[PDB]
From a paper:
[name] synthesis proceeds through two steps, the first being the conversion of IMP to xanthine monophosphate (XMP) catalysed by IMP dehydrogenase followed by GMPS (guanosine 5′-monophosphate synthetase; EC 6.3.5.2) converting XMP to GMP4. GMPS is a class-I (trpG-type) amidotransferase in which the catalytic reaction occurs in two physically distant domains, a GATase (glutamine amidotransferase) domain and an ATPPase (ATP pyrophosphatase) domain5. Hydrolysis of glutamine to glutamate and ammonia occurs in the GATase domain, whereas formation of the intermediate AMP-XMP from ATP and XMP occurs in the ATPPase domain. Ammonia generated in the GATase domain attacks the intermediate to generate [name].
We purified and crystallized PfGMPS, PfGMPS_C89A and PfGATase, and solved their structures by molecular replacement to resolutions of 3.6, 3.15 and 2.6 Å, respectively. The 108 C-terminal residues of the ATPPase domain are involved in dimerization. Interestingly, the nucleotide-binding site of PfGMPS comprises residues from two adjacent monomers, strongly suggesting that the dimer is essential for enzymatic activity. Small angle X-ray scattering (SAXS) confirmed the dimeric structure of PfGMPS in solution corresponding to the active form of the enzyme, as seen from the good fit of the dimer crystal structure superimposed onto the calculated 17 Å resolution PfGMPS SAXS envelope. Upon superposition of the PfGMPS- (conformational state I) and PfGMPS_C89A/Gln (conformational state II) dimer structures, the two ATPPase domains remain invariant, whereas the two GATase domains differ by an 85° rotation and a 3 Å translation when going from states I to II. Probably binding of ATP and XMP by changing the conformation of helix 371–375 could be responsible for the interface rearrangement. It also seems plausible that the charge-mediated interaction between Glu374 and His20, along with the hydrophobic interface contributes to stabilize PfGMPS in the conformation observed for ligand-free and XMP-bound enzymes. His20 (in close vicinity of Glu374 in the apo PfGMPS structure) was mutated to Ala, giving a 23% drop in leaky activity. As the structure of PfGMPS shows inter-domain interaction via Glu374 and His20, the rate of adenyl-XMP formation in PfGMPS_H20A upon mixing the enzyme with ATP and XMP was measured. A progress curve with a single slope and an apparent rate constant of 96±6 min−1 was obtained, and the 1.6-fold drop of the rate constant validates the inter-domain interaction seen in the structure.
Author numbering:
A (entry chain A): 5 to 59, 61 to 378, 398 to 485, 497 to 555
B (entry chain B): 9 to 139, 152 to 230, 235 to 279, 287 to 354, 368 to 379, 402 to 485, 495 to 555
Write the structure that this text describes.
């Protein structure tokens, strides 16, 4: 094959970040699950391997590599990298040892590269052993020269890393040299030149470590050439010129719900390819008030005729789940119904069954969960771009200002956000208060700044609805936004005074993950 | 003096401010009838402010017959806020809708002829118009400042009643009569905000006084102590601040659990009793596993409280076996003896530090009643209680230390059950205003962030925790 980098995830929830800079760097990414057999590697050229973990390994049974994999992985000319847990695993699967760290603090952490001269810049050797001479612990560990291959043009000697470790390594597997010191985690990363292994227990997977993107860049670029990779944007584009050559002879489907992923795909897939594609809209029974129509309206306005269907179907769903507490059950159910309604909708036009390519609202990540722990050859358009990049694409299309700032919707919609009997009247009421809250919220401009806001419900039995808000750095991180009291007293008062049926409002504060992104 | 109850919260703060001066009181609902008055007297009458607009239903229907008798009585009258609106209506005049109204911070102006010439605020009073009451005899200061709460702009007055004042965007805001010394006040003098309001009550009050509270209770207590047949403790010292105070004075001159409470706070609690009670009894009945039981799937509300209640009548008897003002006020207008009533909590607070009490006699959240029945989600089990007690305490822990805790009038936590295992919570914060209202105060964000992170980190069984954002009214303070 012509493939290039492999990135095993042992629960590394910054996996996204690894892929992103791998890409932003103009570079190829590839994915897998850790307990990845070498059964699915393909004899495919791979000049780099990257392992990452950040889920301890001091408790029997924690995840890590398999020997066949590691040894093959080692080879001689094909590099290895390890990171956080990856390093530990790297370390322990070959003569190293590990022990729980003590009170790790992480954070944007300035950190320091380490050469002998830096043996003494360290101004933090007092801890984790003896005396003062900076030189003693250093004398103890291996070391070397200033210029490191994986470090070039840093401008500043100090390296910052935003990092997390609740576990640290205590012995140097094999024979490689020391390249980093941490206040409460002393050895840090150690770089091996014959096993081409370079373990960082910090997280170069961030933007909180710019010198960090640099390290990543450098690593591919240097340890392994990765001479020519593949550019992602260009990808939606070539799948595209390639499809423009045959617009007329080929049919296409869209899966629209107003989701930005969606409108964008269609539109970029609409030009020079106009009369053959049927976007179909399935009501979920759970929308933001008149969201169904607002959504259809936007679509018509964006573009006039692309064979737009509209299928309303609420009661089947409500009936379908008259009073069920299962949650996963709810997902199963909704999925099933959209799949069915979608099948019937598509089939309300009885023709060209297997000459159509469904489109879906899919970027990089969903495609990514594809590997974690009728049917037509598919054609999901966006398989390599990030919500943010797609967001810049939404302006690139010059679509409206309003859509890019969309709180993506869950899918099950209000059902999950509705935690109780699910039915047409109560639910109508909260689609409604959700509206009161969102309008006031957006009235002061927090919409563009509130990553994600959704009144969510609680069946107190009159009724109390709880309001949720989240700052989204990304997919696995969810910090919760605060809203000033002025705005809040009013919003809150407005709702109780205005919507009949609620006696108490709570506001949810729980942070980060905790990713109760929606309650159920 | 008679007070008429129409429901404004300030309606009891009304009585508290009035109480300072030699004063006096009796209680009744809107229809105080006449069988409720005899060989009875007062020289003035205090109307009760309500949120019910008269040209609107629910306006309490004052008994007109009684009103007639009230005039017949031959005594000066005082009508406040709405008492004014209802009163205007018994009379020929009547109101109208809010004149670009509001409440409070508004600063009333006074009037007369010199002062009449003096109003530069009659503009916008109909397309475009231009220009020493018993009530303000000594502020004299010619003006008025106060907390105002009128939804009900009174636009046209009764009969033969000139005005002691007018105001910015509220026109009529004082009515002075000589017919019956009547006065109607649209602004709320019955508040603390009304410094000039203080004298309204005092002067109208004196003018209506042709005794002092502490004075009277100190007296009754000693007399009660005159015979000194006292071996009868007045009541169990559950620890209530009012309790410790009363118990202390009395027991000092002269020679209870389970239901709830937080944790070691509990141990600390009888422990407290002991340090406090050097030589007094600290009875206890640590046994409440029965009723908790009786709480293993049953959630009837009047009943959950009634239950804890007979539960309590129960404890009185079992222990028996081995051997303040506002509350009363709410009960009256609404439809071994209490040692005394001529006092409120603020004053008893001063009494504690006037009697050299330990600190922390003031910054304590007495969730009277269910010690904690209300926070039951429905089912009652030891797991929840302990978890909850722990979280409540983590909750008051942080505020005690950060310094806002004594900042807050009442703080605790409620245990929600609709959150792999899970249950979840609410954090209650209420900077009260009154007995008939409470307003919740924001707790700051960085500090709040940490309190939450600390609770998030201490246990499991609480999946997501949620702050509570509800001011009374609309809905009440204790969540269940």
């Amino acid at each position: 094959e012509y493939d290039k980098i492999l990135v095993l995830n042992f629960g590394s929830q910054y996996f996204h970040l690894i892929v992103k800079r791998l890409n932003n760097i103009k570079i190829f990414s590839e994915t897998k699950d850790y307990g990845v057999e070498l059964k699915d590697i393909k004899d495919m050229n791979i000049k780099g391997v990257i392992l990452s973990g950040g889920p301890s390994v001091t408790e029997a049974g924690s995840p890590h590599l398999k020997k066949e994999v590691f040894e093959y992985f080692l080879e001689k000319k094909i590099p290895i990298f390890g990171i956080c847990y990856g390093m530990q695993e790297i370390a322990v699967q070959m003569n190293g040892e590990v022990k729980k760290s003590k009170t790790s603090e992480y954070g944007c952490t300035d950190v320091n590269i380490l050469r002998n001269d830096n043996i003494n810049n360290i101004t933090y050797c007092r801890n984790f052993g003896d005396s003062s001479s900076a030189m003693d612990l250093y004398s103890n560990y291996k070391l070397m020269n200033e210029t490191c291959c994986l470090f070039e043009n840093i401008k500043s000697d100090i390296t910052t890393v935003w990092m997390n470790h609740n576990d640290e390594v205590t012995k140097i597997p094999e024979n490689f040299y020391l390249v980093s010191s941490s206040e409460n985690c002393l050895i840090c990363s150690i770089y091996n030149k014959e096993y081409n292994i370079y373990g960082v227990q910090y997280h170069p997977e961030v933007y909180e470590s710019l010198d960090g993107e640099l390290m990543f860049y450098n690593f591919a670029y240097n340890i392994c050439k990765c001479k020519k990779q593949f550019d992602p944007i260009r990808y939606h584009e070539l799948e595209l010129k390639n499809i423009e050559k045959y617009k007329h002879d080929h049919y296409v489907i869209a899966a629209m719900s107003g989701g930005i992923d969606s409108t964008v795909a269609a539109a970029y897939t609409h030009k020079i390819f106009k009369e053959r594609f049927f976007g179909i809209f399935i009501d979920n029974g759970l929308l933001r008030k008149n969201e169904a129509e607002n959504v259809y309206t936007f679509l018509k306005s964006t573009f006039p005729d692309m064979n737009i269907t509209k299928i309303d179907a609420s009661e089947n769903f409500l009936s379908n789940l008259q009073g069920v507490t299962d949650p996963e059950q709810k997902r199963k159910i909704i999925g099933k119904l959209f799949i069915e309604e979608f099948e019937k909708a598509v089939n309300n036009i009885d023709i060209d069954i297997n000459k159509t390519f469904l489109l879906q609202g899919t970027l990089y990540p969903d495609i990514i969960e594809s590997k974690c722990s009728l049917k037509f050859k598919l054609f999901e358009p966006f398989k390599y771009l990030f919500k943010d990049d797609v967001k810049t694409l939404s302006r690139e299309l010059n679509l409206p200002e309003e859509i890019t700032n969309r709180h993506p919707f869950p899918g099950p919609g209000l059902a999950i956000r509705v935690i109780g009997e699910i039915n047409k009247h109560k639910l109508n009421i909260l689609r409604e208060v959700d509206d009161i809250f969102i309008n006031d919220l957006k009235q002061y401009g927090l919409y563009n700044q509130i990553s994600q806001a959704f009144a969510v419900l609680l069946s107190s039995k009159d009724y109390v609805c709880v309001l949720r808000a989240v700052k989204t750095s990304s997919f696995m991180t969810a910090n919760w936004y605060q809203i000033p009291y002025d705005i809040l007293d009013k919003i809150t008062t407005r709702i109780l005074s205005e919507v009949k049926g609620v006696n108490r409002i709570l506001y949810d504060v729980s942070s980060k993950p905790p990713a109760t992104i929606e309650f159920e």
